[PDB]
Amino acid sequence: GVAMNPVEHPFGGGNHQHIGKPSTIRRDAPAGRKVGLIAARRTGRLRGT
Amino acid sequence: VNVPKTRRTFCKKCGKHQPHKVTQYKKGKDSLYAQGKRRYDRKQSGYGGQTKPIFRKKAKTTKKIVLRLECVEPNCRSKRMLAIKRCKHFELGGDKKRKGQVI
Amino acid sequence: GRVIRGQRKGAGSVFRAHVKHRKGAARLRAVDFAERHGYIKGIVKDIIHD
RNA sequence: GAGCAGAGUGGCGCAGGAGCGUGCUGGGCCCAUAACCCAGAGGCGAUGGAUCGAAACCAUCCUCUGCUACCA
RNA sequence: AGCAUG
RNA sequence: GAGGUCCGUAGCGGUCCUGACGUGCGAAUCGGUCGUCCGACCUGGGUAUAGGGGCGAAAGACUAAUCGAACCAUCUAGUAGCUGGUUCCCUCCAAAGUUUCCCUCAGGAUAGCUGGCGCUCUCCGCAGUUUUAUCCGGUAAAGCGAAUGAUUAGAGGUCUU
RNA sequence: UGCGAGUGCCUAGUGGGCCACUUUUGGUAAGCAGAACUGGCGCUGCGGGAUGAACCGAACGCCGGGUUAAGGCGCCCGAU
RNA sequence: UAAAACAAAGCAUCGCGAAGGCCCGCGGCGGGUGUUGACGCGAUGUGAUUUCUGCCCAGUGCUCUGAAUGUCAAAGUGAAGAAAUUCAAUGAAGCGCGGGUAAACGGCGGGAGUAACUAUGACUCUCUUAAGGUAGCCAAAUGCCUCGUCAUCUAAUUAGU
RNA sequence: GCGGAAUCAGCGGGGAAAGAAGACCCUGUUGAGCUUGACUCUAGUCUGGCACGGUGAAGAGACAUGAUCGUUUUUUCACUG
RNA sequence: ACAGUGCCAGGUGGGGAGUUUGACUGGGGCGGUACACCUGUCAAACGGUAACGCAGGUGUCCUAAGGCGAGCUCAGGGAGGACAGAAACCUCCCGUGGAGCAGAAGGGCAAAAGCUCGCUUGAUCUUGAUUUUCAGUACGAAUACAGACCGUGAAAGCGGGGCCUCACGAUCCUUCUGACCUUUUGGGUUUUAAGCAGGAGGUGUCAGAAAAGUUACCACAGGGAUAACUGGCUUGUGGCGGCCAAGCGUUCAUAGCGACGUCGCUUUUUGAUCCUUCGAUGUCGGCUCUUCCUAUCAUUGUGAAGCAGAAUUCACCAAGCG
Numbered sequence A: 001g002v003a004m005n006p007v008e009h010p011f012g013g014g015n016h017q018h019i020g021k022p023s024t025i026r027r028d029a030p031a032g033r034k035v036g037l038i039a040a041r042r043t044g045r046l047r048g049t
Numbered sequence B: 001v002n003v004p005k006t007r008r009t010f011c012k013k014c015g016k017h018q019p020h021k022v023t024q025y026k027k028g029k030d031s032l033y034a035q036g037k038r039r040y041d042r043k044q045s046g047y048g049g050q051t052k053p054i055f056r057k058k059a060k061t062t063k064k065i066v067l068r069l070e071c072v073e074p075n076c077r078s079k080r081m082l083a084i085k086r087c088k089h090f091e092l093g094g095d096k097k098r099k100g101q102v103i
Numbered sequence C: 001g002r003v004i005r006g007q008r009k010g011a012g013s014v015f016r017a018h019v020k021h022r023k024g025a026a027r028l029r030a031v032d033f034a035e036r037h038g039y040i041k042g043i044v045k046d047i048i049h050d
Numbered sequence D: 001g002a003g004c005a006g007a008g009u010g011g012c013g014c015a016g017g018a019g020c021g022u023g024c025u026g027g028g029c030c031c032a033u034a035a036c037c038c039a040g041a042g043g044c045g046a047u048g049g050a051u052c053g054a055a056a057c058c059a060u061c062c063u064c065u066g067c068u069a070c071c072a
Numbered sequence E: 001a002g003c004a005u006g
Numbered sequence F: 001g002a003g004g005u006c007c008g009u010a011g012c013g014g015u016c017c018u019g020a021c022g023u024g025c026g027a028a029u030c031g032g033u034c035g036u037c038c039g040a041c042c043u044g045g046g047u048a049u050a051g052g053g054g055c056g057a058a059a060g061a062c063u064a065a066u067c068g069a070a071c072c073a074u075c076u077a078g079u080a081g082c083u084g085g086u087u088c089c090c091u092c093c094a095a096a097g098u099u100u101c102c103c104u105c106a107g108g109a110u111a112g113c114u115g116g117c118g119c120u121c122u123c124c125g126c127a128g129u130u131u132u133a134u135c136c137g138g139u140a141a142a143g144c145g146a147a148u149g150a151u152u153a154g155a156g157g158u159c160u161u
Numbered sequence G: 001u002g003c004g005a006g007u008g009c010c011u012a013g014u015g016g017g018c019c020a021c022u023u024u025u026g027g028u029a030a031g032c033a034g035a036a037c038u039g040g041c042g043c044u045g046c047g048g049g050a051u052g053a054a055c056c057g058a059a060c061g062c063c064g065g066g067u068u069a070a071g072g073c074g075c076c077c078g079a080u
Numbered sequence H: 001u002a003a004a005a006c007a008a009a010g011c012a013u014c015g016c017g018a019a020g021g022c023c024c025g026c027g028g029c030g031g032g033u034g035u036u037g038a039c040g041c042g043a044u045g046u047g048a049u050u051u052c053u054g055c056c057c058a059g060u061g062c063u064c065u066g067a068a069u070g071u072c073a074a075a076g077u078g079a080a081g082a083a084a085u086u087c088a089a090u091g092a093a094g095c096g097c098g099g100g101u102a103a104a105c106g107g108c109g110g111g112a113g114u115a116a117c118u119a120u121g122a123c124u125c126u127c128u129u130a131a132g133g134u135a136g137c138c139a140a141a142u143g144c145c146u147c148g149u150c151a152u153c154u155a156a157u158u159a160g161u
Numbered sequence I: 001g002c003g004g005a006a007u008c009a010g011c012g013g014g015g016a017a018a019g020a021a022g023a024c025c026c027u028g029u030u031g032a033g034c035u036u037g038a039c040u041c042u043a044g045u046c047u048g049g050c051a052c053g054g055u056g057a058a059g060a061g062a063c064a065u066g067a068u069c070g071u072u073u074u075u076u077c078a079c080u081g
Numbered sequence J: 001a002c003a004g005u006g007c008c009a010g011g012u013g014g015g016g017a018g019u020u021u022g023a024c025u026g027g028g029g030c031g032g033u034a035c036a037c038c039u040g041u042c043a044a045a046c047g048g049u050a051a052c053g054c055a056g057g058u059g060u061c062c063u064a065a066g067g068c069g070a071g072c073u074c075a076g077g078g079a080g081g082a083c084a085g086a087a088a089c090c091u092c093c094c095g096u097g098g099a100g101c102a103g104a105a106g107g108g109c110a111a112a113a114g115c116u117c118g119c120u121u122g123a124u125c126u127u128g129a130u131u132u133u134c135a136g137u138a139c140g141a142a143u144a145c146a147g148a149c150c151g152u153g154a155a156a157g158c159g160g161g162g163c164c165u166c167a168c169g170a171u172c173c174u175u176c177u178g179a180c181c182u183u184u185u186g187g188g189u190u191u192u193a194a195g196c197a198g199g200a201g202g203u204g205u206c207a208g209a210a211a212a213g214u215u216a217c218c219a220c221a222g223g224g225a226u227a228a229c230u231g232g233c234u235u236g237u238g239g240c241g242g243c244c245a246a247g248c249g250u251u252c253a254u255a256g257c258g259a260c261g262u263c264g265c266u267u268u269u270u271g272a273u274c275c276u277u278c279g280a281u282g283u284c285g286g287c288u289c290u291u292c293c294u295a296u297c298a299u300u301g302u303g304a305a306g307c308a309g310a311a312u313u314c315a316c317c318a319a320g321c322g
């Protein structure tokens, strides 16, 4: 998504390839906005069970 | 500023100077059945979003202070609305400042 | 903006499953009197790749 | 150039009716030193004004540090 | 409980 | 005799010469030189996806020489404080770029400057002028042995420190 | 001293200005920027400044004669 | 503009046990994934292999629990009033309140003194933050000063190493 | 200062040469693409209320100084149409 | 008998829609407010008068710092008196204001407009007229009256805010106050609502829209009213050259130099301005090629040296050739 243009993905655009906004989003997001990690309870490298 | 709680001043109904209790006027609670309010409600009802302007660019920090004067005569009970110049601080019946004393 | 690809996948134009060479639905047999009370047997004829 | 912030015990800092921890001095403990204990001393960048009275408030100077200074 | 050095 | 293996035909593509041409053979072609060439390969036909939609190994790329929102008709003679144009003669009069207000500074409203039509009178009134009286002013000049603010140099006194 | 005055309607264009003698603010200065008074150019041709928007003279119906303004009178070129 | 861009295998997160996850649709017992079932479907980041992957949950996100003061709409309840009406109690989600999470977006200091010639300063004191840039790497396609300083390459090099 | 018909082959000084109502800059109370902590809305989605929408049995209640009987609010369990 | 559906209610909702994103300005941006006001000056002795001209101030404060009356005189200095002093308190003398009057500045003021006391609420109710900006419109502010009711003083008088010049705000909507007020519509009563008159809730872009960015993917109408490149005026800065003569040059101002001062030229630097050019005059360098200038490096001819020779400096005619 970061490799696209802002017209066609909420992640594209910018003079650097960066997301520019948190990837985690609420489950109650409209279609078009619901991209990335969906309603993540936890994120990062799992360390344990 | 400081204003005493009793003022001897003209009473329109009696036609002569009488004593008056002095208090501060506060704006009353808005009615739901004022003609303008119910016109506004009927215009808001529906689709179209907000219709009348909302004021945002406030500029004045101070409001004019308005004194409510109650005639003390037992059967007169007249009231007048009396405004004075605007000031940041206000009080009723403060202590009478006295000069020539240590501070 | 435009409709995004994950939003286009639900219209089923070019995102439908390629199912011409699939051999069928993999389903157990329908329940019946014999299966509910006793049993029946079958011979395993083929083992194929779909 | 224009904007902002900061000048105070030897050195780092707090803060309208001059202090903190460290440093220093003197005496304790110790064979002695550091550690520890008991005390003491040391001073609001400059100028003018408001206020009864200011390190603090308001202006002007002397230093210092940061943010800018685009577009052809 | 804490006890470094010559 | 394996390999998204190498050189290299056909095919597919399009590097460099920034070569040719550049009112061209051509609204993208030509030559030499190039990349790949058993694979994520090339290709006909059929078929599906249609405009704020499609499709995109992602360049805002392609969607009939049209794409950072196709094309056709209509609403529509859309709006323009902004450019350009605005058709015969003669006679008489003849300016303004200034005041106040406006999301006002390429624009208006308003006063001023103009013209036209008159009317009421005349054959006392007025004046971008002087004179005679009468007031008003604080600029040029001057002053600092006069106030305020500066500022140079010598004198004479004293116990005033 | 000079001169006929008063008064009412309707009204277009204009609301980018510029220059010069004296006064004058900013700026080193400017064919710079900003004001005061008067006159010009814009809206204006004509004689002179060789040439020129605003300089000097003078303002304009079509002509004949005469005379002047400012500026000129070696030749171009009218006039020592 | 053929590239350093995109893709890629690999790595790592996230949601979902079907009345479900993601998505389409004006609408229906509508439809795609789905002839599918976690070794799967869907959503993101990084980019083979080798070696590593430091600290921060203060901010902004996401997420788990609902009983303390809280707030909190419509409907319903009660009371007063002649009635419209007003008042009161009650009180969902969501915000606040309390945990977690950085292979989520992101972030990762300054000032003084000191070693027996100077120079550095391992060491000390101090103000401070959520944490104060760890392992590595460089005038790099990232360094203004800058044509940095040394060495090498040359007769001489703002170039290269 | 000077200048003499009509021409041919070259040439790139000049015509402030040609093409296109400057694409840079500014103005317009002209737009569009995109973004968000701009303003005003909105699809979707989460939650509450009323209707579809029934049958019982218990618990906690308001009722018609203890209990009973029959009116209703709610919690739980069970039933099916 | 809950999923679910129908209809309401609250939350979330750049997924999507519509729209806005001031002005002035030595181009625009950033900065600033010269956008509403006040004092001195500019400002040219009536009044008026500009620039992002100069020096400043304002969005307040005051139950008294408003109103009367009475009684006093201030800043400062001199001379004295236990502690006491540079500076506490007392006394006398001089003292035109050199003090104070809320604040910026200007004006004004001495048995007061200053200081201290006494009594008070003219900072109240009402209709007109006038001045200031001005269009002779509004607001704000102010001035003379007039009619009530009061304060104060023995009284004449003075007072409807602050000694004067600033300190503030329309339509619509809401809110309070006032009348034995009018309407609330076929008639009557009572709530309610609407009127009329006076205050308040505010628009600081202050005669008063409700409002964030980016475009190097861009478009349109125009603009030389307006920048970037060239040309024009100017020459601060840059470059070059003079005049004077403290000193240097072991002596010696001037062979060669030349401080402190001062006068110019040039348009090969940069600025300053915005006159031409936005229905287009092709932007830096390098290559190639021509010509011109002199402010002369070398070459020809000369003059001076702190010129013995050699080499080297200063200057003159001189751009022919490098």
Ligand SMILES: COC(=O)C[C@@](O)(CCC(C)(C)O)C(=O)O[C@@H]1C(OC)=C[C@]23CCCN2CCc2cc4c(cc2[C@H]13)OCO4
Binding pocket: I022, I024, J228, J229, J230, J277, J280, J281, J282, J283
């Ligand atoms: C086909 O059109 C052209 O030639 C191209 C063009 O638009 C390109 C614009 C730009 C230069 C900014 O790229 C242009 O050249 O601009 C203008 C031009 O047009 C012909 C002539 C002008 C006008 C007077 C002399 N000068 C010559 C060049 C020039 C150079 C500039 C500059 C402005 C100009 C202008 O500003 C920075 O340097």
Ligand SMILES: [Mg+2]
Binding pocket: A003, A004, A005
């Ligand atoms: Mg891209």
Ligand SMILES: [Mg+2]
Binding pocket: A006, A007, A009, A010, C001
């Ligand atoms: Mg988007």
Ligand SMILES: [Mg+2]
Binding pocket: none
């Ligand atoms: Mg960032």
Ligand SMILES: [Mg+2]
Binding pocket: B045, B046
């Ligand atoms: Mg509604």
Ligand SMILES: [Mg+2]
Binding pocket: F005
């Ligand atoms: Mg191969």
Ligand SMILES: [Mg+2]
Binding pocket: none
């Ligand atoms: Mg090959």
Ligand SMILES: [Mg+2]
Binding pocket: none
């Ligand atoms: Mg190519």
Ligand SMILES: [Mg+2]
Binding pocket: none
């Ligand atoms: Mg070519």
Ligand SMILES: [Mg+2]
Binding pocket: none
């Ligand atoms: Mg050709």
Ligand SMILES: [Mg+2]
Binding pocket: C011
């Ligand atoms: Mg569709």
Ligand SMILES: [Mg+2]
Binding pocket: none
């Ligand atoms: Mg492809």
Ligand SMILES: [Mg+2]
Binding pocket: F069
């Ligand atoms: Mg469009």
Ligand SMILES: [Mg+2]
Binding pocket: F081, F106, F107
């Ligand atoms: Mg206009």
Ligand SMILES: [Mg+2]
Binding pocket: F103
């Ligand atoms: Mg307005």
Ligand SMILES: [Mg+2]
Binding pocket: F106
């Ligand atoms: Mg025009």
